[PDB]
């Protein structure tokens with residue numbers, strides 16, 4: 001266990017940032033419960049035992065509850081993260097006996113490509129004035145995934161996705177439900193389910209769905 | 213295990229199925245963790261909407277791996293009591309606490325909403341695989357207590373998984389359930405059935421079938 | 426004849442259950458006898474010793490204490506407030522004027538080690554300590570009045586004290 005002193009939280013990069021080369025994934029180290037008395041806080045970033053630099057470390061901000069909060073951000077290499085390099089933050093301070101260290105890394109395990117299926121609304125649903133378009137994403141690993149819906153360029157917004165669910169074979173699956181007006185579905189609009197995942201060719205696949 | 217702050221208490225609702233069927237017994241359960249071995253007496257007081265009740269049953273203390281204890285008290289409830297919104301209160305007394313710990317639980321409040329349930333056949337492109345996915349969409353329900361099972365020709369189809377309830381944009385919930393079957397069984401002409409249990413369904417139960425058509 | 430006086434060791438009239446407390450008198454005794462008479466809600470104790478000891482304070486030990494010796498009159502009562510809880514703001518003085526010092530203490534049940542301790546005025550964090558320490562304003566000011574409380578960690582449990590009011594006078 002532990003006593004008082006500052007606390008540290010290590011946050012991974014967002015999954016979408018690790019898949020798109022145009023984006024920049026970041027690892028983030030937050031230090032809280034930093035007293036006004038000794039307010040010097042030092043960060044040391046290790047990528048598999050490798051002291052790194054070029055970590056944009058931000059000036060301290062005074063919190064409401066009277067403490068100080070200090071965050072350091074380390075831009076990360078897509079391939080390095082995706083290959084399973086472990087990242088590590090060490091923080092040192094006068095109020096600390098020993099410096100604190102945390103480590104994160106991509107979930108271990110053999111990646112597995114997801115299958116994407118579009119399911120049209122059921123017959124009995126076609127009666128209400130809103131209908132439900134389903135997107136089944138199954139058989140993928142790890143659980144880090146992004147799912148979106150699209151129509152004629154503009155992204156669709158009245159959609160909800162379930163969290164990943166552990167399937168029986170050790171893989172995950174999820175569902176995405178897009179609610180549209182019945183007219184739009186009957187008029188013949190084409191809606192699309194885009195999925196981003198590291199086990200996908202080009203980290204991206206798109207499945208379309210329209211009134212047959 | 214220094215256990216400076218003494219025990220912790222957690223209150224757990226009955227399982228949805230237990231409160232939807234008269235032949236099942238629903239139960240509220242109060243679990244006390246981090247009970248020191250030195251001062252281990254734990255007294256349970258149970259209140260039903262602010263009235264003391266003594267028909268509860270206390271399990272014997274169990275030793276955990278972290279060398280703490282675990283005491284459990286289970287109170288069987290009446291179906292109508294839980295469904296009608298009665299509040300349930302656990303009071304825990306311990307020597308390592310300055311005052312007893314109090315936790316209350318009850319069914320979520322708000323007008324129940326009946327679920328619409330829809331059976332969705334396998335996607336065309338999934339039919340090239342050796343296993344297929346029957347989907348069951350249960351939307352527009354409140355509160356989130358719900359049960360879903362799958363069944364074919366009487367016997368219960370088990371190879372399935374159900375997602376946790378998810379909050380919709382209108383304040384209701386929806387979930388999905390997926391049943392994996394071998395393509396042959398689907399291609400024969402067998403019928404499969406999503407069964408749903410919810411308080412706002414007529415007779416607490418609805419059944420929707422799905423087959424090659 | 427002089428009026429005896431009760432004194433509190435230590436000097437906190439607000440204590441928590443299981444806290445130890447010691448009352449002693451300030452009155453001279455006769456040559457014939459050095460006996461003391463202690464009262465407690467005009468109930469009369471039993472021991473005649475010069476100091477009254479409360480090993481494990483219970484809530485039933487709150488109330489008015491007074492004492493009397495052979496060559497003194499009945500003491501004025503002193504109040505003891507035994508509270509229940511995890512934390513209790515204690516002070517050496519509760520009455521404050523402009524430029525007085527404000528000494529506040531966050532006392533914990535059975536002196537249990539307290540960590541990440543925060544002293545709050547008017548619902549906002551005002552001073553933070555990694556380890557349980559006293560709060561001390563050098564010289565008060567009219568803006569230092571408000572409701573005060575203290576919170577922190579009692580070994581993973583996050584606990585709070587009851588709030589007290591604190592007004593600054595004169596000026």
Ligand SMILES: *[C@@H]1O[C@H](CO[C@@H]2O[C@@H](C)[C@@H](O)[C@@H](O)[C@@H]2O)[C@@H](O[C@@H]2O[C@H](CO)[C@@H](O[C@@H]3O[C@H](CO[C@H]4O[C@H](CO)[C@@H](O)[C@H](O)[C@@H]4O[C@@H]4O[C@H](CO)[C@@H](O)[C@H](O)[C@H]4NC(C)=O)[C@@H](O)[C@H](O[C@H]4O[C@H](CO)[C@@H](O)[C@H](O)[C@@H]4O[C@@H]4O[C@H](CO)[C@@H](O)[C@H](O)[C@H]4NC(C)=O)[C@@H]3O)[C@H](O)[C@H]2NC(C)=O)[C@H](O)[C@H]1NC(C)=O
Nearest residue numbers: 007009011012028030032033063064065067069541543553
């Ligand atoms: C003084 O105030 C500050 C800040 O106050 C802030 O503002 C005021 C106005 C109030 O609203 C405050 O409530 C508010 O937060 C206090 O600082 C907080 O300190 C606590 C710890 O005491 C931290 O709690 C942790 O939070 C993380 C999740 O943190 C994300 O989510 C929060 C909302 O959920 C959000 O507020 C945070 O900003 C943060 O958001 C993320 O930020 C990153 C980078 O910025 C970003 O990339 C993300 O996208 C973003 N996510 C969002 C926005 O959703 C939580 O995971 C922690 O729980 C772990 O640790 C617990 C032990 O403390 C343990 O009990 C849990 O079970 C859990 O356990 C860990 O789990 C991981 C993963 O499963 C596992 O690897 C570990 O092994 C395991 N065990 C560990 C780690 O021991 C924890 O809840 C707050 O984040 C922090 N807030 C801020 C803003 O810094 C400060 O405490 C106050 N001081 C005093 C004395 O009161």
Ligand SMILES: *[C@@H]1O[C@H](CO[C@@H]2O[C@@H](C)[C@@H](O)[C@@H](O)[C@@H]2O)[C@@H](O[C@@H]2O[C@H](CO)[C@@H](O[C@@H]3O[C@H](CO[C@H]4O[C@H](CO)[C@@H](O)[C@H](O)[C@@H]4O[C@@H]4O[C@H](CO)[C@@H](O)[C@H](O)[C@H]4NC(C)=O)[C@@H](O)[C@H](O[C@H]4O[C@H](CO)[C@@H](O)[C@H](O)[C@@H]4O[C@@H]4O[C@H](CO)[C@@H](O)[C@H](O)[C@H]4NC(C)=O)[C@@H]3O)[C@H](O)[C@H]2NC(C)=O)[C@H](O)[C@H]1NC(C)=O
Nearest residue numbers: 213220222223224225241243245246276277278279280282
């Ligand atoms: C010593 O060991 C014991 C036992 O440890 C066990 O054995 C070892 C070997 C390890 O494997 C351990 O992992 C293992 O647990 C420790 O006891 C544990 O203590 C923790 C707290 O530190 C408790 O966590 C709570 O868990 C509940 C949910 O717990 C259910 O689900 C668990 C799995 O998810 C399951 O393991 C539990 O048994 C329990 O299972 C349920 O059991 C009931 C009755 O048996 C049954 O009817 C249910 O069907 C069953 N459900 C299942 C199986 O799914 C969790 O809800 C708690 O979270 C709330 O409180 C947290 C505060 O700690 C807070 O951080 C959370 O955000 C959350 O807050 C709540 O949020 C909701 C909304 O989401 C809100 O409505 C509430 O108001 C809000 N606040 C509340 C509730 O206060 C919490 O995480 C473990 O349950 C407990 N384990 C067991 C087995 O009892 C002990 O900690 C160890 N001691 C030390 C010093 O380390």
Ligand SMILES: *[C@@H]1O[C@H](CO)[C@@H](O)[C@H](O)[C@H]1NC(C)=O
Nearest residue numbers: 466468484485486487488489
């Ligand atoms: C003394 O009086 C207080 C206040 O009325 C009460 O709380 C306490 O129980 C009393 N104690 C005795 C011994 O009478």
Ligand SMILES: *[C@@H]1O[C@H](CO)[C@@H](O)[C@H](O)[C@H]1NC(C)=O
Nearest residue numbers: 541542543576577578583584
């Ligand atoms: C304890 O919880 C309070 C709210 O209950 C929260 O504001 C705070 O950050 C925690 N306090 C400490 C001192 O850890």
